[PDB]
Design a protein around this ligand. Structure first.
Ligand SMILES: *[C@@H]1CC(=O)N(CC)C1=O
Ligand SMILES: *[C@@H]1CC(=O)N(CC)C1=O
Ligand SMILES: *[C@@H]1CC(=O)N(CC)C1=O
Ligand SMILES: [Cl-]
Ligand SMILES: [Cl-]
Ligand SMILES: [Cl-]
Ligand SMILES: [Cl-]
Ligand SMILES: [Cl-]
Ligand SMILES: [Cl-]
Ligand SMILES: [Cl-]
Ligand SMILES: [Cl-]
Ligand SMILES: [Cl-]
Ligand SMILES: [Cl-]
Ligand SMILES: [Cl-]
Ligand SMILES: [Cl-]
Ligand SMILES: [Cl-]
Ligand SMILES: [Cl-]
Ligand SMILES: [Cl-]
Ligand SMILES: [Cl-]
Ligand SMILES: [Cl-]
Ligand SMILES: [K+]
Ligand SMILES: [Mg+2]
Ligand SMILES: [Mg+2]
Lengths: 234, 204, 239, 233, 244, 230, 237, 248
């Protein structure tokens, strides 16, 4: 109460309410799913449309040839962070002439996002990311949080009703490592579909897909390009 | 030489209870005379004057920046600045520009505002002060000026003799210098009055 | 209220924001360090909050120099940032003075950094405590521990986090001065299994690292085969 | 009182939510995107007959191929419009091509959360912008309409209303809109909707309308061209 | 007045209506949080610092538990109060002394080092954005003209030279003990300096120490370098005290 | 990075209360007295010197600024040390430019101006001291006071600290314009005795004097000598 | 330096500092402008009278450049800052474009200055509105108004300050092709507009005119009371 | 830190600036200070507050400051604040002189300072200066002049005015006695003593309790003088004689 307006004020329980409030920004975003096999990392996102005549918000963003992201929370914080990541990737190719390893980029995120959690008059980032990448150590899925913590994942879901998606993913995760790409994306879509109200369905208008792997640079699939992946949910 | 671009000469001289300060009147640019009534001596007090020779632009800037500082000083303190203290003020102003100096080498002449004791000094362009009990000179005919002062100056001169001596030292010195002269002005400073004269003088 | 800023003393001369940050470390699961004859061993009870996470996610053991390990408890983003401070300090020390930073000096320097965040309304205290461990032939084995107030001491054995006291009482049973790192890892694993509350928090990974004569003064993860044997020893000891 | 970058327990920035409330104080503006171009239409909201109507400009040209309709605190919109203008000309300078509608909208939207009182320059933005914006234009993707609000969120819309009567107007837009609608139908539709939602009787001086079409540059309708369209409506 | 308060005068270093600085007063209470007491005495030949050494945990490496610090080769110190604050103040002192030598070519006098640390502390009593350090510094050294010196500074930025002094929980009782003992002594000056120091501390705490429960540091006219006594050296003093 | 707002502001009745409260710290300070004789100035102050344990010589309340100027104060000691240091520095800055010792009045002005800054500038409180400043220049003695607002006053004689009101009336009925320095030292020490409590020794009062020869502290033996008659 | 956010949003989208700045404008002296056919006129109230005041030193009508002047209502010290910034800017424009500012250009400049002080740290908004008049290069006469928010509009006629509501009401009824057919009637329309609200009429209405190419002329109290009688004896009929 | 910032430079709900108003209360309590313009000069007359018996008397005045060759000022309010402002006035006057080589015109000096006071009410988060000032001067554009400024950064020209204690009463008396166009320095001096006599109603007026300065022209040069005590007693005498005349 006197402890919930400043990121520099610890509560008597050893918590920081501003960080916890920032995490609500991500819980209220639309759901997204990330998962991986031996060879590919996939992101799957539900796009919310303001009205019946609006397009649908971009949820998946290119970072580098080997890295893409899915977002949940404040879109403007998502872009700022995405632009930071892009820049860190360009720097590594300029200096070393090779891709920035995914776990190193995620580290740089943790460091950058921690800084404002500790200075008066700053605020946490109000965004959570799922990060799909491929490098020397294979495919990855990372998750980043407004707390500046991050996680290396077999699979993950964040956003509204993502608990259901998480439950699906736990149920099937022992199958993921050996899936071919279509099988893996189908799994991602099924997980994401669990977040939906019973009435509603996945369509080409509300689903966005991101894929990267050994043979394939980070590619985004929207609208008509998701149809191949949606037929086969059968 | 930067200091000879405009030419010119100032001197000051001490007498019993009086001081004198004098200057040529030419403002020229190398060979060309531009004007013949250029001011080089400026009041800093009822009984205290500063004479500046050297580059004409810096003669004027130093006189003006000096007056700025002196006016603030006098307003803030109760009082009229002492001669020795003006010297220090000027030295400090010149030495701030140690590495890009003003091209001027001033002389100061005055009476103490309480004791009426005579004071004269000069400074180099970076603010080294030099006080004497006879005379000081500055400008493009300093040697000519030294020759005249060393030979004519005598101690304890009354105002009239002081006037004739400084006048003859200036006229005859500048008449041996191409880029000084076109007139001489002389100020005699006494306890009870300032006498200001221009001299009959060569105009070549 | 007297507990909103680290630049405000309470009427009894306390700084509550530092105490509250300490409470964040005390809510964390337990990490321990044990100094022995020939090096230092660290173990962490690493709670697994989702089965979706990879093995090794959210490591609480770091290399901060080739000879120095760090073990943490508390808010993890704060700990990682402190590990970066420690790394930078070790790096600059080598660049300026031309040799590996001595453990004690490293501890004192990072501690003065932590301390600087306990004086001001402009910033908050770090929500972490951490241990630093090294070994060399010249300096022997050293284990230091730093808390959110910036206090730094050396130890024979140490524990931080929510089962701190229970861990210390088990550690006190060892004659660690005469034991080797190979013997001590088994005892670290044993103690983590004792203090773990298997009803209240369900699933953990044991994390182990060491630095000693046997690693030639390099801080390293305990190899997998040795960790699994230590776990098995711990589990059966729990009997 | 709390700081400008404070989150609420629902995970929103108080100042952004309050700025969103200020949009509701603006006059209604409408945008519609058709395959033949986009139209922007706005209620002027004249407060005195002594006020010159043509000095209310709530539709502005960004570049030849892009217009902008605004609603909310109009003085706040000025720096946003200037930034869009400057950005499209920088892009032309550097790349010798026109900037996309999406790209312009993005650049402007990157200003939105740049406020705060202990990161930035000696007197940088103290609060967000109290403005919503509709960018309508034509680029190589075809005709295009984008909406932006004080959160910095932006999105393409087939039709959209902003300001006081936007609920209402948005409902009528759902009803009348179809993918194959002509530009002239879109112009009539949006004048019809403004007519419903406006407090004042619509006429050719208390509204503005602009279009941008694949053939033709940004065009503000004249009094005369407006009167023509108003006849049927 | 009489314990009155307006506005933010208990949260930051502004004046209360009686002209007090409550935040400064609270920093003095912070000194006692640690629970320790320190004593320092000077005679003609030496100056001594004695403090408690409490190692409650067996798992501590007790060689790292000290409140005694070398500032320069010839200046020692005992710190009392909050530990990390104290360490900060010790580093500052080391920095001031080293800087002084580099600029001026001779060693900082103890009085000057104490005055410097006190002036730095003063700033925290007048600027609102940081708290005072909740600690107290006692410095010993030999001055070439004045002999052995004992100086102390506090969180108010007050400082003084002393015949003897103390800090922490039992400061007042130690001050009493020490005053009573100097009045007795001719030319108001201590002579058995290490014994007075330990005896003071033993009385005001009622303890009768083992050698591992105190630390002792000295400087002497014949040996001006700051020296910390070993356990055996301290034991010799405890035994010689026990036997009369 | 420092607070940028003033911590002293106007109350609804036009009072700057932080300054008034700084004056309350001065009023609770140990007593100080200053008397301007015809041929010099004396400054005297009471040491709040408890313990026989204090080394009285180790810190001084009566302090030199230049050869010809000295200070004493009432209020908070550490605040005073700041102002002593600044006053010294201001005096030397003046000397470097003008090559003449700073006149007493000019030094007071510049110090008083520093005290004014701390009533307005960001994130600081005023100084909790009043200064008495003595000097000799233009063949004449000066005695000035400078208060926590930065206001200053020239006095013939005054008192500050505990019991100052009485001390001032004690001097009112006791100072004359034609009075000598040695007698002034005597009446200054009596003014302190009016409010002392403790029995005075040369180790718990401090006296400084100012005349043609310059400013200096009296030695303990000199004070002892003046104390014999009292 | 002081970086506090001073103007911030409240619940329901208000900017309270700006609203409060507007309250400061409403307690200023009334000011009125009318755009004539080839003249523009500004009149302003009072403010206090006081026989011991040097009249010259407290005018509320101000030249910005030769072809543009302004009146304000609100905090007179705030105005003086706005006026001097606008004067500097008119000279920067002439420098880099070699034309005098249009009335709209300088208006737009004043307005965006105002807007900036509602969105920058460490500052409060300006507590003034302004009526800005002149002529464009092509002879078109102009009357603009700015307010603390930085909003601006062109007007045929307008009032700001205390009693602006009723003065604007009067102008809405009385501004016609007939009331501005000539110079004298335009001037009188302003004096009537004030005389409504102006307490001990009048006495204290400062007035100024600007003609195409002709620069600013202020009327003296002798030249004013000519128009006062010339309107007063007409309203008996 | 937001919690401790008293926010000195913001509006209240009626468009007011409280710190300015509060500073105006401080001024109203300070020593009364009046200014009077005549045909042959201008004067300032001020109540002394430095009046205890043991004070030394070392400067030529207490509240009259010389600003440059042609101008002087007096002040009412916080003294230390007034020293900062009068120092800044002197600097502004020398900066002009340096740049143009003529004296700063009176109104221009006043305006330059007022813009500094204005700034302190609009940004920076500091308390304003607790000072009002009366300025007297001569320049070649408007001759003899009298100005008044206050903490809002507002100023005006006056033929006569008063600040400080009993201001309203003093202005009332001036409204009635002052002759626009017809005052001389001698009659203005008389009116000044009349007004201070009425407005120092605690209690009986004395030369040790007032300061009077006059600004005149002589031989194309400004002369600024603080009247000696002899002249002040003499004028008080003439006022007391003049009241004997009042009835018959
Ligand atoms: C960090 C870890 C997690 O589950 N969340 C909740 C939204 C994060 O942002
Ligand atoms: C004399 C006093 C002291 O400290 N020492 C050193 C052990 C002495 O011998
Ligand atoms: C040090 C010297 C002295 O006499 N005092 C007053 C108590 C000190 O603090
Ligand atoms: Cl989202
Ligand atoms: Cl958002
Ligand atoms: Cl988290
Ligand atoms: Cl989530
Ligand atoms: Cl200069
Ligand atoms: Cl712990
Ligand atoms: Cl809307
Ligand atoms: Cl060295
Ligand atoms: Cl002894
Ligand atoms: Cl601040
Ligand atoms: Cl010093
Ligand atoms: Cl000196
Ligand atoms: Cl001395
Ligand atoms: Cl600006
Ligand atoms: Cl209005
Ligand atoms: Cl001048
Ligand atoms: Cl001048
Ligand atoms: K403080
Ligand atoms: Mg010649
Ligand atoms: Mg020739």
């Amino acid at each position: 109460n006197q402890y919930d307006n400043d990121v520099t004020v610890w509560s008597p329980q050893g918590r920081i309410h501003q960080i916890e409030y920032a995490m609500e920004a991500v819980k209220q975003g639309s759901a997204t799913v990330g998962l991986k096999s031996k060879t590919h990392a996939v992101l799957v996102a539900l796009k919310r449309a303001q009205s019946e005549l609006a397009a649908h918000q971009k949820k998946i963003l290119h970072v580098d040839n080997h890295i893409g992201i899915s977002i949940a929370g404040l879109t403007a914080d998502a872009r700022l962070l995405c632009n930071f990541m892009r820049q860190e990737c360009l720097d590594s190719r300029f200096v070393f002439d090779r891709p920035l390893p995914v776990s190193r980029l995620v580290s740089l995120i943790g460091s950058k996002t921690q800084i404002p959690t500790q200075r008066y008059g700053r605020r946490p980032y109000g965004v959570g990311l799922l990060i799909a990448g491929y490098d020397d150590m294979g495919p990855h899925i990372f998750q980043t949080c407004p707390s500046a913590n991050y996680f290396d994942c077999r699979a993950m879901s964040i956003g509204a009703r993502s608990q259901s998606a998480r439950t699906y993913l736990e149920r099937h995760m022992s199958e993921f490592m050996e899936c071919n790409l279509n099988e893996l994306v189908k799994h991602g879509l099924r997980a994401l579909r669990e977040t939906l109200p019973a009435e509603q369905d996945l369509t080409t208008k509300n689903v966005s897909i991101g894929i990267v792997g050994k043979d394939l640079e980070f590619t985004i699939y929207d609208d008509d390009d998701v149809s191949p992946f949606l037929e086969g949910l059968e | 030489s930067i200091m000879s671009y405009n030419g010119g000469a100032v001197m000051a001289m001490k007498g019993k209870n009086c001081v004198a300060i004098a200057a040529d009147r030419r403002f020229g640019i190398q060979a060309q005379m531009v004007t013949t009534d250029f001011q080089k001596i400026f009041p800093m007090g009822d009984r205290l004057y500063i004479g500046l020779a050297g580059l004409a632009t810096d003669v004027q800037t130093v006189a003006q920046r000096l007056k700025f500082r002196l006016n603030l000083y006098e307003l803030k303190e109760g009082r009229q600045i002492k001669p020795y203290t003006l010297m220090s003020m000027v030295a400090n102003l010149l030495y701030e520009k140690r590495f890009g100096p003003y091209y001027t080498e001033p002389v100061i002449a005055g009476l103490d505002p309480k004791t009426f004791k005579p004071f004269i000094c000069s400074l180099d362009l970076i603010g080294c002060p030099m006080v004497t009990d006879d005379f000081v000179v500055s400008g493009t005919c300093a040697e000519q000026m030294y020759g005249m002062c060393e030979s004519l100056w005598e101690p304890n001169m009354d105002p009239d003799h002081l006037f004739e001596t400084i006048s003859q030292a200036m006229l005859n010195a500048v008449d041996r210098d191409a880029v000084s002269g076109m007139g001489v002005i002389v100020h005699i400073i006494e306890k009870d009055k300032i006498t200001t004269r221009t001299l009959k003088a060569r105009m070549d | 209220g007297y507990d909103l800023s680290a630049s405000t003393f309470s009427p009894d001369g306390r700084v509550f924001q530092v105490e509250y940050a300490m409470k964040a470390v005390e809510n964390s699961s337990t990490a321990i360090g044990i100094r022995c004859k020939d090096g230092v061993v660290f173990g962490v009870e690493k709670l697994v909050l989702s089965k979706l996470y990879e093995e090794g996610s959210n490591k609480r053991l770091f290399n901060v120099d080739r000879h120095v390990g760090m073990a943490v408890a508390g808010l993890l983003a704060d700990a990682r940032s402190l590990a970066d401070i420690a790394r930078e300090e070790a790096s600059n020390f080598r660049s300026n003075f031309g040799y590996n930073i001595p453990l004690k000096h490293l501890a004192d320097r990072v501690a003065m950094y932590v301390h600087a965040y306990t004086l001001y309304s402009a910033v908050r205290p770090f929500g972490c405590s951490f241990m630093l461990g090294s070994y060399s032939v010249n300096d022997g084995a050293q284990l230091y521990m730093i808390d959110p107030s910036g206090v730094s001491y050396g130890y024979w054995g140490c524990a931080i986090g929510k089962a701190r006291q229970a861990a210390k009482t088990e550690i006190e049973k060892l004659q660690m001065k005469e034991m080797t790192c190979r013997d001590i890892v088994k005892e670290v694993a044993k103690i983590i299994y004792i203090v773990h509350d298997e009803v209240k928090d369900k699933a953990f990974e044991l994390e182990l690292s060491w630095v000693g004569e046997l690693t030639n003064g390099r801080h390293e993860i305990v190899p997998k085969d040795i960790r699994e044997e230590a776990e098995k020893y711990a589990k059966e000891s729990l009997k | 009182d709390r700081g400008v970058n404070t989150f609420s327990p629902e995970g929103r920035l108080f100042q952004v939510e309050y700025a969103i409330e200020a949009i509701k104080l603006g006059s209604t503006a409408i945008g519609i995107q058709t395959s033949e171009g986009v139209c922007l239409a706005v209620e002027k909201r004249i407060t005195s007959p002594l006020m010159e109507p043509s000095s209310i400009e709530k539709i502005v040209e960004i570049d030849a191929h892009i217009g902008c309709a605004m609603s909310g605190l109009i003085a706040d919109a000025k720096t946003l419009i200037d930034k869009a203008r400057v950005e499209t000309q920088n892009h032309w300078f550097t790349y010798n091509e026109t900037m996309t509608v999406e790209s312009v909208t993005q650049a402007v939207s990157n200003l939105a959360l740049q406020f705060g009182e202990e990161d930035a320059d000696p007197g940088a933005m103290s609060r967000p912008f109290g403005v919503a914006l509709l960018f309508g234009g034509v680029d190589e993707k075809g005709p295009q309409l984008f909406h932006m609000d004080p959160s910095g969120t932006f999105v393409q819309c087939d039709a959209r209303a902003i300001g006081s009567a936007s609920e209402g107007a948005q409902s009528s837009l759902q009803e009348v809109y179809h993918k194959s609608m002509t530009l002239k139908e879109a112009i009539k539709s949006s004048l019809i909707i403004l007519k419903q939602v406006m407090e004042e009787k619509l006429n050719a001086t208390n509204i503005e309308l602009a279009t941008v079409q694949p053939g033709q540059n940004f065009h503000m309708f004249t009094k005369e061209e407006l009167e023509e369209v108003i006849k049927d409506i | 007045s009489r314990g009155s308060s307006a506005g933010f005068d208990r949260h930051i270093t502004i004046f209360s209506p009686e002209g007090r600085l409550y935040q400064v007063e609270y920093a003095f209470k912070a000194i006692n949080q640690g629970g320790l007491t320190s004593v320092a005495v000077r005679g003609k030949d030496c100056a001594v610092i004695v403090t408690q050494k409490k190692v409650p945990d067996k798992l501590l490496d007790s060689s790292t538990v000290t409140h005694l610090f070398k500032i320069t080769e010839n200046i020692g110190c005992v710190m009392t109060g909050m530990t990390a604050d104290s360490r900060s103040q010790v580093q500052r002192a080391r920095y001031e002394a080293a800087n002084w030598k580099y600029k001026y070519g001779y060693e900082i006098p103890v009085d000057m080092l104490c005055k410097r640390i006190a002036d730095i502390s003063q700033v925290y009593t007048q600027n609102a954005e940081m708290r005072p350090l909740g600690c107290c510094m006692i410095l010993i050294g030999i001055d070439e003209e004045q002999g052995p010196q004992v100086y102390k500074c506090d969180p108010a930025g007050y400082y003084c030279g002393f015949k003897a002094t103390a800090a922490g929980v039992k400061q007042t009782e130690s001050t009493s003990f020490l005053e009573k003992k100097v009045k007795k002594k001719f030319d108001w000056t201590f002579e058995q300096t290490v014994e007075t120091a330990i005896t003071c501390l033993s009385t005001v705490l009622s303890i009768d120490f083992k050698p591992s429960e105190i630390e002792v540091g000295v400087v002497t006219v014949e040996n001006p370098k700051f020296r910390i006594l070993t356990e055996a050296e301290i034991d010799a003093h405890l035994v010689a005290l026990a036997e009369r | 990075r420092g607070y940028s707002f003033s911590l002293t502001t106007f109350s609804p009745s036009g009072k700057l209360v932080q300054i008034e409260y700084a004056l309350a710290a001065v009023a609770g300070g140990a007593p100080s007295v200053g008397i301007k004789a015809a041929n010099g100035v004396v400054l005297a102050t009471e040491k709040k010197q408890k313990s026989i344990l204090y080394d009285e010589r180790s810190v001084h309340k009566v302090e030199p600024i230049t050869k010809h100027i000295g200070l004493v104060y009432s209020g908070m000691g550490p605040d005073y040390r700041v102002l002593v240091h600044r006053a010294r520095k201001l005096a030397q800055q003046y000397y470097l430019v003008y090559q003449e010792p700073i006149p007493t009045a000019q030094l007071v002005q510049r110090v008083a101006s520093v005290m004014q800054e701390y009533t307005q500038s960001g994130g600081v409180r005023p100084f909790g001291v009043s200064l008495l400043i003595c000097g000799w220049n233009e063949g004449r003695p000066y005695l000035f006071q400078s208060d926590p607002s930065g206001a200053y006053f020239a006095w013939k004689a005054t008192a500050m600290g505990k019991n100052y009101v009485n001390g001032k009336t004690f001097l009112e009925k006791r100072y004359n314009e034609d009075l000598e320095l040695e007698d002034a030292i005597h009446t200054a020490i009596l003014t302190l005795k009016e409010s002392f409590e403790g029995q005075m020794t040369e180790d718990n009062i401090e006296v400084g004097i100012c005349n043609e020869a310059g400013f200096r502290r009296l030695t303990p033996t000199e004070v002892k000598d003046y104390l014999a008659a009292i | 330096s002081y970086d506090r956010a001073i103007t911030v949003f409240s619940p329901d989208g208000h900017l309270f500092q700006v609203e409060y700045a507007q309250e400061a404008v409403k307690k200023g002296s009334t000011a009125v402008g009318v755009r004539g056919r080839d003249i523009v006129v500004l009149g302003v109230e009072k403010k206090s009278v006081a026989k011991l005041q040097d009249e010259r030193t407290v005018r509320k009508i101000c030249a910005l450049d030769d072809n543009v002047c302004m009146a304000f209502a609100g905090l007179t010290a705030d105005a003086r800052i706005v006026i001097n910034r606008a004067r500097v800017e008119c000279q920067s424009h002439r420098l880099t474009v070699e034309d005098p500012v249009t009335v709209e250009y300088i208006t737009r400049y004043i307005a965006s200055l105002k807007q900036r002080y509602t969105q920058s740290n460490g500052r409060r908004p300006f507590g003034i509105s302004a009526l800005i008049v002149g002529f464009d290069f092509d002879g078109t006469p102009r009357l603009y108004q700015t307010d603390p928010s930085g909003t601006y509009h062109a007007w045929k006629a307008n009032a700001i300050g205390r009693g602006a509501k009723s003065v604007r009401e009067f102008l809405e009824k009385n501004y016609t092709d007939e009331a501005i057919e000539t110079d004298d009637l335009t001037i009188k329309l302003v004096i009537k507009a004030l005389l409504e609200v102006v307490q001990s009429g009048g006495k204290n209405i400062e007035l100024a005119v600007m003609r195409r190419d002709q620069s600013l002329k202020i009327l003296n109290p002798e030249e004013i009371e000519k128009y006062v009688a010339e309107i007063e004896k007409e309203k008996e009929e | 830190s937001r919690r401790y910032d008293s926010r000195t430079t913001i509006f209240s709900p009626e468009g007011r600036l409280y710190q300015v108003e509060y500073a105006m209360e401080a001024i109203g309590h300070a020593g009364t200070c009046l200014g009077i313009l005549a045909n042959d000069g201008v004067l300032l007359a001020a109540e002394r507050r430095n009046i205890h018996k043991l004070l030394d008397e070392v400067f030529f005045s207490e509240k009259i400051y010389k600003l440059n060759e042609d101008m002087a000022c007096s002040v009412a309010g916080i003294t230390s604040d007034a020293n900062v402002l009068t120092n800044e006035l002197r600097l502004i006057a020398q900066r002009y002189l340096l740049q143009y080589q003529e004296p700063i015109p009176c109104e221009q000096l006043v305006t330059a300072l007022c813009d500094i006071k204005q700034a302190y009410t609009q940004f920076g988060g500091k308390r304003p200066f607790g000072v009002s000032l009366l300025y007297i001067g001569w320049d070649k554009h408007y001759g003899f002049q009298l100005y008044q400024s206050d903490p809002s950064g507002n100023y005006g020209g006056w033929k006569a005015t008063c600040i400080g204690n009993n201001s309203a009463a003093a202005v009332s008396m001036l409204k009635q006695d002052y002759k626009e166009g017809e005052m001389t320095l001698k009659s203005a001096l008389a009116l000044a003593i009349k007004v201070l006599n009425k407005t120092m109603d605690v209690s009986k007026l004395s030369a040790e309790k007032v300061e009077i300065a006059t600004l005149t022209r002589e031989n194309g040069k400004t002369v600024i003088r603080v009247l000696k005590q002899k002249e002040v007693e003499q004028l008080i005498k003439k006022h007391e004689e003049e009241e004997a005349k009042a009835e018959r």
